[PDB]
């Protein structure tokens, strides 16, 4: 039933020769020269980092004064790019060993702490991506020491000749290939520097003008950072013009090394961009997610020494590692935002109004219940048990629940007045249960997807009203029996209503649970029905036979049957609208206007 | 104010010593084994590609040599010994080729094979190898690697290594024709001795390899690379299944474009538009090369506004990064993106002609991508290309039915200059804008733009057909004034202007002077026009002194009813309790 050819059959005959791996060096030069990096411009990053390492080796050994800097020059007329550092330089033996041997890194034999970038022994060859000729002039300290010129066309061979007039350090001239002349442009070179080499530890000069390198804030001690320094750094990393309303400066060492800053912009998010975020670093140079999708409103920077880098310094090398980093950051950001709620609830209300949509998206799109509930801790509602305007949370609702209660009741309505006076809340007031009031458009969807919180099932007031019909409906009316239609009158009214609304409602019943309102529409899965109307069901019309409008309808059906029918139709429509289950309300206006005149004689 | 230290001061004195570039072979094995790829699992992709190439070389030998011999790649896991084994029945390797091909970094037997083929030999486009390093990915995951190989000529051989500097070679019996590679997995890579883990990697990268792949005796890669076949020989059901696979979807493609071409690059591609519609509560076009996955999410081959497309792009000659997971920057790849943009745009315009019904549903669903594209590009010729897909409503024909900018440019007074538009919430608010009647005197036809972001789409557009887009932004004589003057006093906050106009069935309506101030009343300056013949307004005139409580309930309702008729209030829940009062008081 199976097809296999792999069998343990092989056996060694006789002896074995030992061999050493070799290398096809001409082809290796070519691989590094056109196949290693996806973007040609990174030769600038590679040569600058070598210059920084040379300056580090000099700074380290001179403890044990001279200037320590990196100079760039563009000559568009001669088509050349030049970088010179004032670092340790190289002697002749160093030039042929380090530049001559691919994968040889002097900067790795240097130990035996943390400023060095070099390791792979290949970065220098990236110049041959953009140059058909490379000259190096280098001068060691002290040491012997003559000056040397190293020269190569990049494919095969190089030459080393003694030289005079070589300044302490190293100068590299690239005679640019004809299709790489952009790198003889000052603006072009400047933009590559600030992209990749913007936090280098030594001054960089481009054509005699010093460049505005920055401090790597994320690596520094958090209360050595003023608010003003965060405003400026935020504007740089977010390329923004405003300022951050929150700043989270997050360092960790276990389980992962993490050095990170996150900002929430003062600006409200663009709605065009929400439907249309953080830079990743190591050793202060860039890597080409890190955050769950719902936290993409965050700006800032993340740096982690546990992210291994591929040879090219643009791929990150362990995806499960990245899910772990993502999950650590997500929990830390949730903890931060909860803390902001405690510190300053009014400012958090503003933040929740501007960014809450991201919390809702996060809850709806996660599959992990514990993650859903963690994000849900950020949500804010009002409550029937609190004064109007006062914001509360799911956890505060949980803590007020009596020892016996098993469910969290909520009511979705456009504003505080409507929830407080909803027919659905009037029905719930008969019970002894707090009711969360939720005013935002996608609140109900969110709670439906959340489903439970702290092992307590979420139940909307509308749903709960229907489930009571199938329990011991032990509810008493708000007006005494004198003030309601008699049973004979109700049943006569209901039989008339069923005939007049025959192809619209599944059933029509009297309810003891309304006071202000004449009627309500009920649907077991009310929240799902509201959402499904996102461009016919089994709705029940429940009537308050103590309401003056219902009592009048019962009279109109015999005193003016046609006026009663227009009125019945409008009561149904009003209840549908109150239920949030109404289609386009415009065609109702004619009947209402026709009803209004007829009612007003 | 300058400070530059770069000066022409060096002069060569002495002679040249000429040297050859070399390589530090041990550290290079470490790099090419561990620091190349973004995932350890790629070693399976690499060894399967090598096996495929071995099989392709054997098939090519048999055109002239005509040997036989099943052509298969077999994988075997062993979770007790912690090993992963791959065996192919291809050309194998004699002792010379083992030492040369395995023993030398960057040495590629398959590249030399390719370089010696006739131009149009079928194997020229199927051989994956190139860089000479892929095999070393085994040492990412393996403490020890053993290769048993038998060539198709004349003795079997065993190549062995721990990855550090050196390897051994010995004669071996009894090796089957071809090559068997045994990986002794590192402890922290034991997962690749799990059958289910290996299956995941095979399907991820190697699902379309041209030769049957078996795992522990059972066949895997059952999918065929539709994008390589003749567009005619593919039926609609095959596209539906391939779409569902490649997009990880459960619906159907509403549109299918199967595009093949040969310059600027060899391209074999299928693009699909889903039938279902995106929501904020939530793949991409994959890039392939020679039937191997390069990127599940192809980055730079399509403009970002075409990211709603799903499907596959395969190129035999696209310049690949050493990792085989990225493209090198390339004028050819920039030119391909421009080519694909034009091709897709043309396919969509054709669909609009073949089926305006279908295309209208499509624009409703995906027009945000067309608008985003016109906004975010910086080339005017492209903006007018994407704009050919835009649809709007127009004054010149009724609701629901749509027209293109080319259709508008068609019907214009002989020698008309500008294209005229008005971005508004809806048709009713547009037909009553103080700025619409003015242009109903000049250039009669004006485009009505109800959609979100229509405004900045046309502003960022700025010029289509080299023509400029530009916006623009009964009852007695005076017993009506008695009622009209009484009205502002009871609505001092909301409306400001309350006129009187001839409406028929409606007592009042709402009009707005600027759709900019009305479009974000919906996230106000309303005018309340009134017909004095309506029986609710002659009624309102009466009760204001009769039943003044009833007369304001009636007033709020006429206002709210008018706001609903104008689409400025679409959720009337706040009125309902009051309306119920009005109704209860009107009925006595
Ligand atoms: N500007 C420089 N000044 C001094 N030494 C340098 C310079 N650039 C390169 N080197 C030496 O040459 C070596 C080879 O560099 P490279 O091939 O780029 O690999 P890596 O940067 O990983 O060391 C470096 O390790 C360093 O020892
Ligand atoms: N399974 C195999 N059967 C026969 N030859 C192989 C096999 N695997 C590798 N080779 C040979 O060894 C060479 C080196 O393989 P590799 O280092 O992966 O580089 P590439 O595939 O880019 O050539 C290949 O070109 C091919 O000649």
Coordinates of C-alpha atoms in Angstrom, one line a residue, chain A residues 2-7 9-13 15-25 27-29 31 34-40 69 71 73 82 84 86 92 96 99-104 119-120 137 149-150 152 156-167 171 205 207-209 272 275-276 293 310-311 314-319 361 364-365 414 418 442 517-518 547-549 552 563 567 574 577-578 580 585-586 589 592-593 595-597 599-600, chain B residues 2-7 9-13 15-25 27-29 31 34-40 72 74-76 85 87 89 95 99 102-108 130-131 148 158-159 161 165-174 176 180 214 216-218 280-282 307 321-323 325-329 372 375-376 453 507 536 539 550 557 561 564-565 570-574 576-577 579-580 582-584 586-588:
Chain A
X2 CA 3.1 2.2 0.4
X3 CA 6.0 3.0 -2.0
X4 CA 9.4 3.3 -0.4
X5 CA 12.9 2.9 -1.8
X6 CA 14.9 4.0 1.2
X7 CA 16.5 1.0 2.9
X9 CA 21.5 -1.1 2.6
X10 CA 24.8 0.7 2.2
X11 CA 28.1 -0.4 3.7
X12 CA 31.6 1.1 3.4
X13 CA 34.2 -0.8 1.4
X15 CA 39.4 2.8 3.5
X16 CA 38.5 6.5 3.2
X17 CA 40.4 9.6 2.0
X18 CA 40.3 12.7 4.1
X19 CA 39.6 16.0 2.3
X20 CA 39.3 19.7 3.1
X21 CA 36.5 21.9 1.8
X22 CA 37.6 24.3 -0.9
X23 CA 36.1 27.5 -2.4
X24 CA 35.6 28.9 -5.9
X25 CA 36.9 32.3 -5.0
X27 CA 32.5 33.1 -8.1
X28 CA 32.4 34.0 -4.4
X29 CA 33.5 37.5 -5.2
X31 CA 28.1 36.3 -5.3
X34 CA 25.7 41.2 -7.1
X35 CA 23.8 38.4 -5.2
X36 CA 24.2 39.0 -1.5
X37 CA 22.4 42.3 -0.8
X38 CA 18.9 43.0 -2.3
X39 CA 19.7 46.8 -2.4
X40 CA 22.9 48.3 -3.9
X69 CA 35.7 60.9 12.5
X71 CA 34.4 61.7 6.1
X73 CA 32.9 62.8 -0.4
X82 CA 35.0 58.3 -1.1
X84 CA 37.9 58.1 5.0
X86 CA 40.8 58.3 11.1
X92 CA 50.6 45.7 4.5
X96 CA 46.3 41.5 2.2
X99 CA 40.8 42.6 2.4
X100 CA 42.3 39.8 0.4
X101 CA 40.5 36.9 2.2
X102 CA 36.8 36.6 1.9
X103 CA 35.1 35.8 5.2
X104 CA 38.3 36.9 7.1
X119 CA 31.9 39.7 12.0
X120 CA 31.3 38.1 8.6
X137 CA 45.0 54.0 1.2
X149 CA 47.7 51.5 -1.6
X150 CA 45.5 48.5 -2.2
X152 CA 41.5 46.0 -7.4
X156 CA 40.2 38.1 -9.2
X157 CA 43.3 39.9 -8.3
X158 CA 44.6 42.9 -6.3
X159 CA 47.9 44.7 -5.8
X160 CA 49.6 46.4 -2.9
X161 CA 52.2 49.1 -3.4
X162 CA 53.9 51.3 -0.8
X163 CA 52.7 54.9 -0.6
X164 CA 53.5 58.2 1.1
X165 CA 51.2 61.0 2.1
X166 CA 48.7 58.5 3.7
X167 CA 47.0 59.9 6.7
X171 CA 40.7 56.1 2.6
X205 CA 31.1 64.6 7.5
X207 CA 31.6 67.0 1.7
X208 CA 32.8 69.1 4.6
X209 CA 29.4 69.5 6.3
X272 CA -7.7 56.7 5.1
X275 CA -7.8 50.8 5.9
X276 CA -4.6 51.4 3.8
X293 CA -1.6 43.9 13.6
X310 CA 21.4 36.7 8.0
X311 CA 24.5 37.5 6.1
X314 CA 17.9 42.4 6.2
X315 CA 16.4 39.1 7.1
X316 CA 15.6 38.0 10.7
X317 CA 16.3 34.4 11.3
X318 CA 13.8 32.7 13.7
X319 CA 10.1 33.2 13.2
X361 CA -10.2 44.7 15.9
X364 CA -12.4 40.2 16.9
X365 CA -9.4 38.8 15.0
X414 CA -26.2 55.0 20.7
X418 CA -31.2 55.8 25.0
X442 CA -18.9 48.0 16.8
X517 CA -42.9 52.1 25.7
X518 CA -46.0 50.6 23.9
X547 CA -49.7 51.9 27.4
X548 CA -52.1 54.6 26.3
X549 CA -51.1 54.1 22.7
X552 CA -56.1 53.5 22.0
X563 CA -56.8 54.5 11.1
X567 CA -51.3 53.2 13.5
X574 CA -41.1 52.4 15.6
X577 CA -36.2 51.2 14.7
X578 CA -35.9 51.0 18.5
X580 CA -32.0 48.7 15.6
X585 CA -36.2 54.6 7.2
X586 CA -37.0 57.0 4.3
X589 CA -41.9 58.9 6.2
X592 CA -46.0 58.6 9.0
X593 CA -46.8 61.9 7.3
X595 CA -50.7 59.0 9.6
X596 CA -49.9 62.3 11.2
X597 CA -52.5 64.3 9.2
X599 CA -54.5 61.5 13.4
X600 CA -54.6 65.3 13.7
Chain B
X2 CA 33.6 73.5 5.9
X3 CA 35.7 70.8 7.4
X4 CA 37.0 68.3 4.9
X5 CA 40.1 66.1 5.3
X6 CA 39.9 64.1 2.0
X7 CA 42.8 65.3 -0.1
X9 CA 48.2 63.6 -1.2
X10 CA 49.1 60.0 -1.9
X11 CA 51.6 58.8 -4.5
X12 CA 52.8 55.3 -5.0
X13 CA 56.5 54.8 -4.4
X15 CA 56.6 48.3 -6.7
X16 CA 53.5 46.3 -7.0
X17 CA 53.0 43.0 -5.1
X18 CA 50.1 41.3 -6.9
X19 CA 47.9 38.9 -4.9
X20 CA 44.9 36.7 -5.6
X21 CA 41.7 37.0 -3.6
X22 CA 41.3 34.1 -1.2
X23 CA 38.6 32.8 1.2
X24 CA 38.7 31.5 4.9
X25 CA 37.0 28.2 4.1
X27 CA 34.3 30.4 8.5
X28 CA 32.7 30.4 5.0
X29 CA 31.1 27.0 5.6
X31 CA 28.2 31.5 7.0
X34 CA 23.9 29.1 9.1
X35 CA 23.6 32.8 8.2
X36 CA 22.0 32.8 4.7
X37 CA 18.3 32.0 5.2
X38 CA 15.6 33.3 7.4
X39 CA 14.5 29.8 8.5
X40 CA 16.3 26.5 9.3
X72 CA 11.3 10.2 -7.8
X74 CA 11.9 10.0 -1.4
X75 CA 12.0 11.4 2.1
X76 CA 12.2 9.4 5.3
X85 CA 16.9 11.2 4.9
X87 CA 16.9 9.9 -1.8
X89 CA 17.0 8.3 -8.4
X95 CA 33.9 10.1 -6.7
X99 CA 34.7 15.8 -4.2
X102 CA 30.1 18.9 -2.5
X103 CA 33.7 19.8 -1.5
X104 CA 33.9 23.2 -3.1
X105 CA 31.9 26.2 -1.8
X106 CA 30.1 28.1 -4.7
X107 CA 30.9 25.2 -7.2
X108 CA 27.8 24.3 -9.1
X130 CA 23.0 28.2 -9.5
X131 CA 25.0 29.5 -6.6
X148 CA 25.7 7.9 -0.7
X158 CA 30.0 7.5 0.7
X159 CA 30.7 11.2 1.4
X161 CA 31.2 15.2 7.2
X165 CA 36.5 22.1 7.7
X166 CA 36.8 18.5 6.4
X167 CA 35.0 15.6 4.9
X168 CA 35.8 11.9 4.1
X169 CA 35.1 9.8 1.0
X170 CA 35.0 6.0 0.8
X171 CA 33.8 3.4 -1.7
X172 CA 30.4 2.0 -0.8
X173 CA 28.1 -0.9 -1.6
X174 CA 25.3 -1.2 -2.5
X176 CA 21.2 2.6 -5.7
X180 CA 20.8 9.4 -0.7
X214 CA 7.2 10.5 -1.3
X216 CA 7.8 7.6 4.5
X217 CA 6.4 5.6 1.5
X218 CA 3.4 7.9 0.9
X280 CA -11.2 45.1 8.5
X281 CA -11.7 42.0 10.7
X282 CA -9.0 39.9 9.1
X307 CA -2.5 44.0 -3.4
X321 CA 19.2 36.9 -3.8
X322 CA 21.6 34.3 -2.6
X323 CA 19.0 33.3 0.0
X325 CA 13.9 34.4 -0.7
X326 CA 14.3 37.9 -2.1
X327 CA 14.8 39.6 -5.5
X328 CA 17.8 41.8 -6.2
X329 CA 17.0 45.3 -7.1
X372 CA -5.9 54.6 -3.1
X375 CA -3.8 59.1 -4.5
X376 CA -0.5 57.4 -3.7
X453 CA -12.4 59.4 -0.5
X507 CA -44.1 69.3 4.2
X536 CA -49.3 69.3 8.2
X539 CA -51.9 72.3 10.6
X550 CA -48.6 69.4 20.6
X557 CA -41.2 65.5 13.8
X561 CA -38.7 63.5 9.1
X564 CA -34.2 61.5 7.4
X565 CA -35.5 62.2 3.9
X570 CA -30.0 57.4 9.1
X571 CA -30.4 56.0 12.6
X572 CA -33.6 57.6 13.9
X573 CA -33.6 55.9 17.3
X574 CA -33.4 59.2 19.3
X576 CA -38.9 57.3 18.6
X577 CA -40.0 57.9 22.2
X579 CA -42.8 60.4 18.2
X580 CA -44.7 57.9 20.3
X582 CA -46.8 62.9 19.6
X583 CA -48.8 60.0 18.3
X584 CA -50.4 59.4 21.7
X586 CA -52.6 63.4 18.5
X587 CA -55.1 60.6 19.1
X588 CA -57.8 61.7 21.5

